[PDB]
Amino acid sequence: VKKPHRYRPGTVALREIRRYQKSTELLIRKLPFQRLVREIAQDFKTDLRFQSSAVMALQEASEAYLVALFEDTNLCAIHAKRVTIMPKDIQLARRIRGER
Amino acid sequence: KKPHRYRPGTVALREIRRYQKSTELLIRKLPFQRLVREIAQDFKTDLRFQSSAVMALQEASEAYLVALFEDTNLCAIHAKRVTIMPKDIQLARRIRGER
Amino acid sequence: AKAKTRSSRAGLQFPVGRVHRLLRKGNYAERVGAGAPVYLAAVLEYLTAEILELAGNAARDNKKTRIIPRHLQLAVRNDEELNKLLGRVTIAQGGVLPNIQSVLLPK
Amino acid sequence: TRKESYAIYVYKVLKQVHPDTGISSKAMSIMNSFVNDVFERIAGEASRLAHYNKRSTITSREIQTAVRLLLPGELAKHAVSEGTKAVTKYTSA
Amino acid sequence: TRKESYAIYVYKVLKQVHPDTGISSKAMSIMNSFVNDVFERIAGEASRLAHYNKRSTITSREIQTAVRLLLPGELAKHAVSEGTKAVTKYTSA
Amino acid sequence: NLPKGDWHCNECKFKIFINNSMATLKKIESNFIKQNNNVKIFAKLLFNIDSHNPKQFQLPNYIKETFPAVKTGSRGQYSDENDK
Amino acid sequence: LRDNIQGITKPAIRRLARRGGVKRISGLIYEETRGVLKVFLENVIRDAVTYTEHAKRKTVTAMDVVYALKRQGRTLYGFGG
Amino acid sequence: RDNIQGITKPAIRRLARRGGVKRISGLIYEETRGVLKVFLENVIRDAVTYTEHAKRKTVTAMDVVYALKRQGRTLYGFG
DNA sequence: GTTTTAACCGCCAAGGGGATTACTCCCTAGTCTCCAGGCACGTGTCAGATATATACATCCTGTGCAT
DNA sequence: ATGCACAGGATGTATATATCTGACACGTGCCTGGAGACTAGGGAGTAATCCCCTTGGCGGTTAAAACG
Ligand SMILES: [Zn+2]
């Protein structure tokens, strides 16, 4: 008769949304992002040294842009009477934004 | 003895083809000038206007409206629809940043 | 006589002399009007006071004695004119406004 | 060397509006960045206006027009009032 | 009075690439406006570059940097090649 | 002669005071059996009228339409072919 | 000068949408289009009049419209440059 | 070398949550990886351009600030 | 498909202001001399971080009432 | 047996309190950048001219708008 407790689908999601719409700290791991940045900074020049402040500013800007894109994608998916986002929503959002 | 009417939508496609090849203005000039002067009335009275200015406003407005219509069409199609809804326009303007 | 700051003469807190020097060295025009730096410093001081007031209100609402970037972001995004002004401005560690769509709420 | 900023003036303004509220370093860094951004925007618009009318001098009228063009509504009105009052006070003094 | 434009040089280039092709006045003005806009973009970017580096001169290096920043890919590369070639030719002659 | 107090609509007070979604039917059947002795046909209407706000009388859209020369004015007034 | 925004007739908006690639159009669109167009026109004309007034002029030139459009990030070619 | 896979799905989920996203498809993650990569190229190219024109070998934060500013994305808090 | 209107064209006329030109003048760039406002630097607290230990507030499933 | 309405255990969140720290605020020397004084000459303000360009109107056609 022993049952394990578990919330219904969509509860932990709302809890996380509330949690992360309140905090402001960065969400991406520092080292993987730094390694990705350095790898990208090789097809323009080799042996590129980096101030830490540049890396953190890049992370801030990238995360802000990604969050804004996520919110636009959410609006696009909601407009399609859905709660799940699929990449066509991202494509439409970037197309309307003029990125495409 | 039949009216011989075209099906709903083929005429729309024909006029889309017609108006996607032309370049002339689609709005009557006199009403547009009257509206422009009416709007300008609220900022300063007794304002005179060069005709090239009114043409400039008409061209810019029509281009912006065409762009907005194109975005709205994509938004409505994303909803798997064929008719344009005002909610599509509102979403498009919000995404652009105008809202 | 004794030197008197032009800010004091205009009753401002922003350094009018520094503003005038920066205007001269900013390659904006050959000549700079005498009443220009005063006007610019006054406008800057007014905007600074406005946003500082809003940020202090936000910080107090968080029961904190020091304004943090989160307070600045909240004040800017909550003020319609200020948000429109800084439409394309990204604030570091500012976070976002807590907002959840209605349809995602449990019903 | 020494680098100048707006820290002291922003601090004084804060003490005028909130005589008890402190501030962190990141906040006033953002403050200085915002001040510089506004300064550059207004100065560039004023220079553009001056070149538009074929004039070699930047006066307070140019800044008034630039502020009217850059700030929305009530902010623009209030800033115009502040600039006019400060100019009149300085000229009278 | 007299107003200047890029009409004659545009017509020269048109005859260079398409010797048998005419042009309307409105289109001609369109190219004039386009050239003006590109001029402003490059000049402003070069000025910002000079100010950032604390320099008193606008040299061809700054022009090349601005061209790279404002032009997409192959356009930037070909324009850089053309500018370098023209500079070399002028310096030699 | 202002009431000087919390005022609510007839529908508003009905929805704010007697709002028993489970036991509304209990009150309906109570009124029905109360009126069953004398007037059972009208019991439901006698209950329901207390759930509605005061209104201005209007013809029910078919008394008007049997006469083609009659039209309704702006504020519900009567208008005919002599209106100009 | 009153009630001119109705001057943009429904066929005009229809043609605008047809050039925009729209095939089927709802009837409750036209007033929304008129409102958005009014907002855009007000935004442009405000800055155009500001430019005209700063020059102490009484007529609005096309070149003022060019500057106003440029400042709003909508560059237009072919009207003076 | 697949640092693009250093962007794990928990981080993408967290960013979506801060963006107010409730339900996420499985195909989303790679799309975000690609879009983020494109953004990074666009910024970093200009950043390196600025670093080179200054005849420097170390990229400074001010270079990134200028690159973001010229792309229409103003950033504060760094100079 | 049928009916209505006002956009548009042409043609004309009057005048307002924007461009032009000449003259003047006062305002700002330029120069020198002087001094204190702001900045780099050093100390000292206390706002907030951090840790732990309790009230809440929901989530959610298992009860009944009865239709 | 079905839709509603409580009871309650689980659970994650918010409060209360104690402690410690480094991050902010404050005190100080100095020096260089702003202030005060003076000049000249040119950019800007002012006055007179004109004529072009802006506005305004009137009549006729009809394409386009309106309507069902
Ligand atoms: Zn009521």
- Which domains does chain A show, CATH number per domain? 4-100 (1.10.20.10)
Cα G16 to Cα G6: distance, rounded to the nearest angstrom: 16
Residue-range domain boundaries for chain C: 1-107
Determine the residue among C99, C104, C105 to mutate to test chain A binding: the one whose Cβ has the most chain A Cβ atoms within 10 Å: C104
Per-position DSSP letters for C42-95, written without gaps between them: HHHHHHHHHHHHHHHHHHHHTT-SEE-HHHHHHHHHHSHHHHHHTTTEE-TT--
Angle, in degrees to the nearest 10, between helices H28-53 and E60-70: 170
Distance CA A42, CA H48 (A): 10
C1' of I24 to CA of G79 (Å): 38
Within 8 A by CB and 6+ apart from G81, the residues are E29, E32, E33, E36, E37, G66
Q: How far is the CA of F25 from the centre of ligand 1 (A)?
A: 22
Resolution in A: 4.0
* CB proximity under 8 Å: G 19-58 to D: 47, 50-51, 53-55
DSSP states along D31-66:
HHHHHHHHHHHHHHHHHHHHHHTT-SEE-HHHHHHH
CB-based burial, C4-34: b 16+ in 10 Å, e otherwise = eebbebbebbbbbeebbebbeebebbeebbe
- The CB density around residue A6, as the number of other CB atoms within 10 Å, is 8
Q: Please tell me what DSSP assigns to residue A8.
A: P
Cβ–Cβ contact G61 with D under 8 A: no
Q: Are A73 and H46 in contact (CB under 8 A)?
A: no
Chains meeting F at 3+ CB pairs closer than 8 A? none
Neighbours of G15 (CB within 10 A): 19
Q: Which residue has the tokens 């202090």?
A: C56
Bridge partners of residue B83, in order along the sequence? G24
Q: Do A98 and A69 contact (CB within 8 A), yes or no?
A: no
Domains of chain G: 1-79 (1.10.20.10)
Tell me the CATH number at E75: 1.10.20.10
The number of folded domains in chain E is 1
D27: domain range? 1-93
Q: Is D54's Cβ below 8 Å from some Cβ in H?
A: no
Q: Chain H within 8 Å of C102 (Cβ-Cβ)?
A: no
Residue of H nearest to E54 (CA): H54
Q: Is G59 helix (H, G, I), strand (E, B) or coil?
A: strand
Architecture of the CATH domain C1-107 = Orthogonal Bundle (1.10)
**CB–CB of A46/B65 below 8 Å?**
no
Q: How far is the CA of D90 from the C1' of J48 (A)?
A: 36
Nearest to A57 by CA among H78, G66, D45, G38: H78
- Decide: B98 and G37 in contact? Cβ < 8 Å: no
3-state secondary structure of D18: coil
Spell out the residues 6+ positions from residue H78 whose beta carbon is closer than 8 angstroms to its own: A53, A57, C92, D29, D33, H61, H62, H64, H65
